[PDB]
């Protein structure tokens, strides 16, 4: 771990880092949320904002210090604050932003600023390529409704890493976290669909646990079986 102001950064693979930010949300403690930073040749790609604009600007500061290449785009994985709370900071920095069309639709009512561009998805869940131009190694997949109706996931080609966002919790988790906007009927199938989309990913990264093996997926799905 690298502490940088109030955030934490951890290298996961040669061109991949996890960003972590915290929100002291009254009645729950200081909640960590993780996203990703990927160097693709001469540019940087970001998955998820931090909770706030200020924290997200700090992610960009860390990138400037440690990588020193332009951030070409960011993709955010649903319309909750931990994933989209820093959209304004990305826009102020001139970064092109992407989210599930449904996330952009939901953003205002969730108190979020929408991304600039909307991703749409084929019936099988893979992103429609025209809507994710220049995504390089980021392979975006909609696994079905789970943690939220709009949750999306991202594999990183050239690595063993797939990012489940808030859909997936680690193999030791006692709960599925914030289910306030969850789809209880479809959660288990959506967790399993994420696993099936990225079958060779041995490192599973997620919002509210440290990186884990694929047991994160099986355990999450087995816990989600109890929601039905
Ligand atoms: O979330
Ligand atoms: Zn969420
Ligand atoms: Zn979350």
Curated annotation (Swiss-Prot):
Query: What EC number(s) is this enzyme filed under?
Result: 3.5.2.6
Q: What controls its activity?
A: Inhibits by captopril, thiorphan, dimercaprol and tiopronin. This enzyme is not susceptible to inactivation by the beta-lactamase-blocking agents clavulanic acid.
GO biological-process terms attached to the record: antibiotic catabolic process; response to antibiotic
**Residues bound to Zn(2+) 1:** 78, 80, 147
Which residues are listed for Zn(2+) 2 binding in this entry?
82, 166, 208
Miscellaneous note, as given in the UniProt record, is: Enterobacteriaceae carrying this gene (identified by PCR) have been isolated in Sweden, India, Pakistan, Bangladesh, England, Scotland, Northern Ireland, Australia and the USA. The organisms they were identified in were K.pneumoniae, Enterobacter cloacae, E.coli, Proteus spp, Citrobacter freundii, Morganella morganii, Providencia spp and Klebsille oxytoca. In India most isolates were from community-acquired infections rather than hospital-acquired infections, indicating the gene is widespread in the environment.
The record's note on quaternary structure and interaction partners says: Monomer.
What role is this protein assigned? Confers resistance to the different beta-lactams antibiotics (penicillin, cephalosporin and carbapenem) via the hydrolysis of the beta-lactam ring. Does not confer resistance to the polymixin colistin or the fluoroquinolone ciprofloxacin.
Q: Record's family?
A: Belongs to the metallo-beta-lactamase superfamily. Class-B beta-lactamase family.
Q: What is this protein called?
A: Metallo-beta-lactamase type 2
Q: Specify the species.
A: Klebsiella pneumoniae
Lineage summary? Bacteria, Pseudomonadati, Pseudomonadota, Gammaproteobacteria, Enterobacterales
Gene symbol of the encoding locus? blaNDM-1
Full-sequence portion shown in this chain: 43 to 270 of 270
């Amino acid at each position: 771990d690298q502490r940088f102001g109030d955030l934490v950064f951890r290298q996961l693979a040669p061109n991949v880092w996890q960003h972590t930010s915290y929100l002291d949300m009254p009645g729950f403690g200081a909640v960590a949320s993780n996203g990703l930073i990927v160097r693709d040749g001469g540019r940087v790609l970001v998955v998820d904002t931090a909770w706030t604009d200020d924290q997200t600007a700090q992610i960009l500061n860390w990138i400037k210090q440690e990588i020193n290449l332009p951030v070409a785009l960011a993709v955010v994985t649903h319309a909750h604050q931990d994933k989209m709370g820093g959209m304004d900071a990305l826009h102020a920095a001139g970064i092109a932003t992407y989210a599930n069309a449904l996330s952009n639709q939901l953003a205002p009512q969730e108190g979020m600023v929408a991304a600039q561009h909307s991703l749409t998805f084929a019936a099988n869940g893979w992103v429609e390529p025209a809507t994710a131009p220049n995504f390089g190694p980021l392979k975006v997949f909609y696994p079905g409704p789970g943690h939220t109706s709009d949750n999306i996931t991202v594999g990183i080609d050239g690595t063993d890493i797939a990012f489940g966002g808030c859909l997936i919790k680690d193999s030791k988790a006692k709960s599925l976290g914030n289910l306030g906007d969850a789809d209880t009927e479809h959660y288990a199938a959506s967790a399993r669909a994420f696993g099936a989309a990225f079958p060779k990913a041995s490192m599973i990264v997620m919002s509210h646990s440290a990186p884990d093996s694929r047991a994160a997926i099986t355990h999450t799905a087995r816990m989600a079986d109890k929601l039905r």
